[PDB]
Design a protein around this nucleic acid. Structure first.
Lengths: 98, 105, 75, 95, 79, 72
DNA sequence: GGGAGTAATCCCCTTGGCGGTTAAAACGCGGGGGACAGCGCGTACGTGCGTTTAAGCGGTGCTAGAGCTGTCTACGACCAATTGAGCGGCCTCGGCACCGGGATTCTCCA
DNA sequence: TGGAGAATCCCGGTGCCGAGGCCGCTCAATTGGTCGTAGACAGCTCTAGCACCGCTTAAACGCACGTACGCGCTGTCCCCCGCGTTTTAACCGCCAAGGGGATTACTCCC
C-alpha cells in the first residue's frame, strides 16, 4: 500500500488551513465551557450567541498570533519541534506575564 | 441647500456634528472641522474600497467578502502599520511559510 | 545616566533638522528622552538575555536581536 | 420599530463613485461601519486632549489636522491633509 | 470539566492554521491554562460592566468594549 | 552630520551589564544604534508636531511627557 | 425643571430536550529522520594597559521668544418653523457555492 | 529518473436567498436673527539656552594575546506521524416553558 512521507501532509494542511477561514472548534463544547466559567462569578448569567462567537473569533486571533510567534521562536531556536519552554519564554518576552 | 452640497462633500456634516455634540468632548466647535474630518473619512475609505476592488479583480469575484478586505489590509505596509494593532472578525491569516520549513531536497 | 549628554543633544538636533529647521531645546525634556530611552533599551537587553539563554548561548548577535523586534512587532 | 442610524447609503454612493460594477456583502459593510465609528471616537479622543492640553474649550480644524499628522505617518498623511485642505477651501469659498 | 471538549485534533487544526509545522503533545495543558487566564480576565471585565449597566443578559457590545480597553479591539459588532 | 557613532561601545557594554547580557558580539552595536535611531526619529517627529501646534518654536517638558506617554 | 426609580407587558429572545445521523476524536502500531549527547576546532571575544580627546563644569552676554494682560468683536450657542434627506416594510432576480467527473498536476523508487 | 495513484481544478447544471431598489413616512438639518463671549492681536516683561572658552580628566581605543564554547560532523533512538479502526457527541429542528429589555405612564429630588 501507499503511505506518504510526513511533512508533505503538514504542508498541505498548513496551506488548506491558511487558505480557509471557518471556525474549526465546535460551538457547543465552548458554549458549555463559558457557561461553567460564567457560573463561577455570578449565577444565571445569560449569553447572546453574538458575544460567544465574538469571543471565539478573538480566541482564534490570539491563538494564531501566539502560534506564529511560537513558530518564529522555534525556527529561531534551530528546531522544528515545539516544547513548552518555548511557551513560557514566548509568554514572558511578550510581557503578558511578568 | 444642505451643507454637503455647498461643501462639495459627500459624508453628512450634521450627523458627525451631532455626534460631536453628544460626545461632550468640549463646549464650542468650529465649522469646517467636521468637513475636514469627513473628507479624510471618504479619502481613507475610498482607498480601502479601491484595494478591495483590486482584490476583487484579483480573485475573479464581483461581490466582496471580507477576505478581500483582509488581503487588502495585510499586504500594504502602511495598513499593516496602522491596523496591525487591531484584529479582524473573520480575518484569517495569510499563507506564509519559512525557508527552512520548505522541503530542501 | 551613563550615556553621555552633548552628542545626545547634538544627534537629537541633527535628526530634528530633518523634520524642521532650527529648534531650541530645554534641558529637562532631553533628560526625559535620555532616561526613557535608557529604560527601553535596558528592557530589550533582559529580553535578549532571555533569548540568548533560551538559545543555549552566551553571546548575543543581531539575528537574535531582531526576532525580538518582531516579538514586539516594530520595524 | 426603533430607529438606528447607519452609513450604508453614504459609503454606498462613495463606492459607486469609485467602483462601478462591484458588489459588497453585509459583513464587509458592518466591519467598515464599525471601522469608521472607531476612527471617529479615537480621533475625537486626540482632538479632545489636544484641545485641553492647549487650554482650549473650542474645537478648530487646526487641531484635527494636527491630530492626524501626530498619528498618521508617511506620505498618505500629506495626501489626506492636501485633499482636506481643498475640501475646507471649497467649503469656505461656497456661497 | 468542559475543557476536554477542546479536543486535541482541534488544537492540531488550529496549530496548522497558526503556522506550526511540527507539534509535540505537551502544549495542550499550557494552552488550556493560559486560556483560563485570558478568558476569566475578559469575562470578569465583561460581567463587571454588564452589571454596571444593571442588566443580566450579556451581549456582544460590552464584549467589544472590554476588548477595546485592552487595545486590540474587534470590528463588526457596532464598536 | 554623522553622529550615530557618538554612542560609544563601552557605553553600550554598560547598557549590556545593566541589561544583564554576559557576552557581546561585534555586530550588535550598529544594530542597536539603528534601533535607537528609529525610536528617536519616531519620538522627535511627535515632539516637532507638539512644538508646531503650540504656536511656539521650542520643546518643553509637557511636550516630552505627552510624547513618551502616547506610546505607553 | 429635567434625571431617575417604580409598575405591567409582551413578544421576541434564551435555553434546553429529545430522536437521528455522521464525519470526526482517539487509539494502535511500525517507523525513520531530526533532537540531542559527544569531540575538534579556531576564532572572535574578554581583559589589560599606553594614549588621547572630547569632556565636566564654571563664567558671561543677551536677546528674543516664552509668559502674562487689555479688549472687543467676530464667532458660536440656541431657539421657532420647515422639509426632503434619509429611516424602514416588501419584492424580485441574479451571484455564488453545491454535485460531479474528467483534465491537470505532485510524489517516490525502481 | 516515469508511471500508479491520488489530490486539485474547473466547467456543465442547479437552487436559493439576500442586495438592491420601490415606495411610505418622519423628524433632525436648515434659515435666520440675536447676544454672550473668549481668544487674536498688540504690547510689556524677563530669563535662561545657546555660544564661546578655558582648566583639568575619566573614559575610550586599539593592539596583544589566551582560550571557551557555538558550530560542524558523527552516532543514536524514540516518539509522535500516516494509516486504519472504532465509538461519539454535534447538530438539525421542533416544540415549549418562560423570562426580561424596552415601552408607556406616575411621581419624586437636587
Amino acid at each position: 500500500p501507499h503511505r506518504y512521507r510526513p511533512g508533505t501532509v503538514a504542508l498541505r494542511e498548513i496551506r488548506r488551513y491558511q487558505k480557509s477561514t471557518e471556525l474549526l472548534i465546535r460551538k457547543l463544547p465552548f458554549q458549555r465551557l463559558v457557561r461553567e466559567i460564567a457560573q463561577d462569578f455570578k449565577t444565571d448569567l445569560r449569553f447572546q450567541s453574538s458575544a460567544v462567537m465574538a469571543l471565539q473569533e478573538a480566541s482564534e486571533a490570539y491563538l494564531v498570533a501566539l502560534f506564529e510567534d511560537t513558530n518564529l521562536a522555534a525556527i529561531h531556536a534551530k528546531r522544528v519541534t515545539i516544547m513548552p519552554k518555548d511557551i513560557q519564554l514566548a509568554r514572558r518576552i511578550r510581557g503578558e506575564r511578568a | 441647500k444642505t451643507r454637503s452640497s455647498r461643501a462639495g462633500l459627500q459624508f453628512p456634516v450634521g450627523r458627525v456634528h451631532r455626534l460631536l455634540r453628544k460626545g461632550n468632548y468640549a463646549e464650542r466647535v468650529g465649522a469646517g472641522a467636521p468637513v475636514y474630518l469627513a473628507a479624510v473619512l471618504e479619502y481613507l475609505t475610498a482607498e480601502i474600497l479601491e484595494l478591495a476592488g483590486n482584490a476583487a479583480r484579483d480573485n475573479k469575484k464581483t461581490r466582496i467578502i471580507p477576505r478581500h478586505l483582509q488581503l487588502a489590509v495585510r499586504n500594504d505596509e502602511e495598513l499593516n502599520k496602522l491596523l496591525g494593532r487591531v484584529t479582524i472578525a473573520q480575518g484569517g491569516v495569510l499563507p506564509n511559510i519559512q525557508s527552512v520549513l520548505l522541503p530542501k531536497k | 545616566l551613563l550615556i553621555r549628554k552633548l552628542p545626545f543633544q547634538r544627534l537629537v538636533r541633527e535628526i530634528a533638522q530633518d523634520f524642521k529647521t532650527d529648534l531650541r531645546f530645554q534641558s529637562s525634556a532631553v533628560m526625559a528622552l535620555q532616561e526613557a530611552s535608557e529604560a527601553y533599551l535596558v528592557a530589550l537587553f533582559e529580553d535578549t538575555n532571555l533569548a540568548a539563554i533560551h538559545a543555549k548561548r552566551v553571546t548575543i548577535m543581531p539575528k537574535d536581536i531582531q526576532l525580538a523586534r518582531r516579538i514586539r512587532g516594530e520595524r | 420599530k426603533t430607529r438606528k442610524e447607519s452609513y450604508a447609503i453614504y459609503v454606498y454612493k462613495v463606492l459607486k463613485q469609485v467602483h462601478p460594477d462591484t458588489g459588497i456583502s453585509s459583513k464587509a459593510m458592518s466591519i467598515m461601519n464599525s471601522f469608521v465609528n472607531d476612527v471617529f471616537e479615537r480621533i475625537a479622543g486626540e482632538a479632545s486632549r489636544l484641545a485641553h492640553y492647549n487650554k482650549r474649550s473650542t474645537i478648530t480644524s487646526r487641531e484635527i489636522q494636527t491630530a492626524v499628522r501626530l498619528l498618521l505617518p508617511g506620505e498618505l498623511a500629506k495626501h489626506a491633509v492636501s485633499e482636506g485642505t481643498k475640501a475646507v477651501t471649497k467649503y469656505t469659498s461656497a456661497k | 470539566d468542559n475543557i476536554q471538549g477542546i479536543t486535541k485534533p482541534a488544537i492540531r487544526r488550529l496549530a496548522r492554521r497558526g503556522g506550526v509545522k511540527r507539534i509535540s503533545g505537551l502544549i495542550y495543558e499550557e494552552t488550556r491554562g493560559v486560556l483560563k487566564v485570558f478568558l476569566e480576565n475578559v469575562i470578569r471585565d465583561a460581567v463587571t460592566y454588564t452589571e454596571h449597566a444593571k442588566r443580566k443578559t450579556v451581549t456582544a457590545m460590552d464584549v467589544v468594549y472590554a476588548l477595546k480597553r485592552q487595545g486590540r479591539t474587534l470590528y463588526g459588532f457596532g464598536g
